């Protein structure tokens, strides 16, 4: 069966960090659900792009499990993810089932908020390092994409394609990732 991804979309999310992974994962044949944190209605992203989610998170969370849970960044979007009890429950279930969790930019700070994956090596946006490192619960990395077991992190808008291809490689293998990569004209 095809792999399945849950992308959790909150107000103030970074739209490039949302759309690039959705697009790349769909190119890889992954069944992606863009789930709105607040409900079914369109979401106003950080740079005012408005995205219509496929489902509310309330509905999508009942249709798991997912092979990957993806947390976009954007400072305000990640704060919203960090405050959500529903996100907490989803991430703890994914961690308990030994499923992949992928977060980019400010997104990894929701892992801290929900006490996920402590002891991992992680990266974030440079400006999100201090928040992520509060308490010393992770070891910091400057790699553009970082992966420590089932915790896969990345840094910013400009690492989104690399982040997404790393998700594809983890779920569908290096050959599929390479085939998806070539038509993208990445640098």
Query: Which residue's CB is nearer to its own copies, number 48 or number 175?
Result: 48
Q: Which does 155 bind (CB under 5 to 8 A by kind): Cl ion, its own copies, none?
A: its own copies
CA distance 59 to 77: 20
Encoded one letter per residue, x for contact with Cl ion by CB under 5 A and - for no contact, window 63-82 reads: -----------xx-------
Residue 11 lies near its own copies (rule: CB under 8 A): no
Are 8 and 85 in contact by the 8 Å Cβ rule? The answer is no
Encoded one letter per residue, x for contact with its own copies by CB under 8 A and - for no contact, window 86-125 reads: ---------------------------------------x
CA distance 154 to 108: 8
Residue 29 lies near its own copies (rule: CB under 8 A): no
Cα separations in angstroms, 87 against 4, 27, 69: 17, 26, 10
Residue 156 lies near its own copies (rule: CB under 8 A): yes
Q: Which helix (H) or strand (E) holds 151?
A: strand 151-154
Dihedrals phi, psi of 79, to nearest 5 degrees? -60, -45
Smallest separation (angstroms) from its own copies to the CB of 163: 11
Count of C-beta atoms within a 10 Å radius of residue 177: 19
114 is an active site residue: no
105 is an active site residue: yes
CA distance 10 to 46: 10
Residue 44 lies near Cl ion (rule: CB under 5 A): no
Point out the residues that are catalytic: 105, 125
Please report, as ranges, the residues that interact with its own copies according to CB under 8 A: 14-16, 19-20, 22-23, 26-27, 34, 42, 47-52, 125-127, 144, 155-159, 161-162, 183-187
């Amino acid at each position: 069966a095809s792999k399945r991804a849950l992308v959790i979309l909150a107000k103030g999310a970074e739209e490039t960090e949302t759309v690039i992974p959705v697009d790349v994962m769909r190119r890889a044949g992954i069944k992606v659900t863009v789930a709105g944190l607040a409900g079914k209605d369109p979401v106003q992203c950080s740079r005012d792009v408005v995205i219509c989610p496929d489902a509310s998170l309330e509905d999508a969370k009942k249709e798991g499990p997912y092979d990957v849970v993806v947390l976009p960044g954007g400072n305000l979007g990640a704060q919203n993810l960090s405050e959500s009890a529903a996100v907490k429950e989803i991430l703890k279930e994914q961690e308990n089932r030994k499923g992949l969790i992928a977060a980019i930019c400010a997104g990894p700070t929701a892992l801290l908020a929900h006490e996920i994956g402590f002891g991992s090596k992680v990266t974030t946006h440079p400006l999100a390092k201090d928040k992520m490192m509060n308490g010393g619960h992770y070891t910091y990395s400057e790699n553009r994409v970082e992966k420590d077991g089932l915790i896969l992190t990345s840094r910013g808008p400009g690492t989104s394609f690399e982040f997404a291809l790393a998700i594809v490689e983890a779920l569908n293998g290096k050959e599929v990732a390479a085939q998806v990569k070539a038509p993208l004209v990445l640098k």
